């Protein structure tokens, strides 16, 4: 395992993140759905306050999920374009040449997400496999100055406090699905 084909190490590495990224999805989706259930439970107990703040969490967890489906995709995208990834060695290349196919918008973000998503430890492997293809400077140029990192990404990683409106709107919806009678403060 010394002089083995890049194209291979990368294909297996990505394939991994996918497998785990989806696992996190299935698990957190089911987990979040059971939280919704409990949210309704708190309504049927006049615990208005404890049902409010609780939902705020429901949002951040739901937003996290989104960030996963998005990272999933970004990988799959790269996995296919593996052949095209092997023909790169400088930043200039990826930057102003593979921006239409989304190769850049995908790899750059994934590396950023490393710190923020710890349920897919294997992601870090990609950062390392970048110096293997480019350098150790590229990675630091992302984790630090998120150069060309999608807006929706950086934002779903550290989601801003939930808007009062969205919360109330959420509660009202959880009620129209489980029961409850009075959703006050709307």
């Amino acid at each position: 395992p010394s002089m083995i084909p890049f194209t291979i190490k990368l294909k297996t590495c990505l394939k991994m993140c996918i497998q785990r990224l989806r696992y996190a999805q299935e698990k957190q989706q089911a987990i979040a759905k059971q939280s919704r259930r409990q949210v309704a439970q708190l309504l049927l107990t006049n615990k208005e306050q404890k049902a409010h703040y609780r939902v705020e969490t429901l949002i951040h967890d739901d937003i996290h999920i989104e960030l996963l489906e998005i990272l999933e995709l970004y990988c799959e995208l790269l996995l296919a374009r593996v052949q095209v990834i092997n023909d790169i060695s400088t930043e200039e290349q990826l930057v102003k040449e593979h921006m239409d196919d989304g190769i850049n918008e995908a790899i750059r973000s994934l590396i950023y997400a490393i710190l923020f998503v710890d349920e897919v430890k294997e992601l870090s492997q990609l950062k390392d496999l970048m110096a293997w293809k480019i350098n150790v400077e590229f990675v630091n140029g992302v984790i630090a100055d998120h150069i060309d990192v999608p807006e929706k990404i950086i934002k779903k990683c550290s989601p801003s406090v939930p808007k009062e409106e969205l919360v109330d709107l959420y509660l009202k919806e959880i009620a129209k699905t489980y029961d409850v009678p009075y959703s006050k403060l709307e």
């Binding site: 259930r37 919806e173 489980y178």
Partner: peptide, 17 residues
């Protein structure tokens, strides 16, 4: 019921878009 919470979730997300 059972399949009612499924759509609920489906509608939730879009509701934040």
């Amino acid at each position: 019921d059972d399949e009612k919470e499924d759509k609920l979730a489906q509608r939730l997300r879009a509701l934040r878009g």
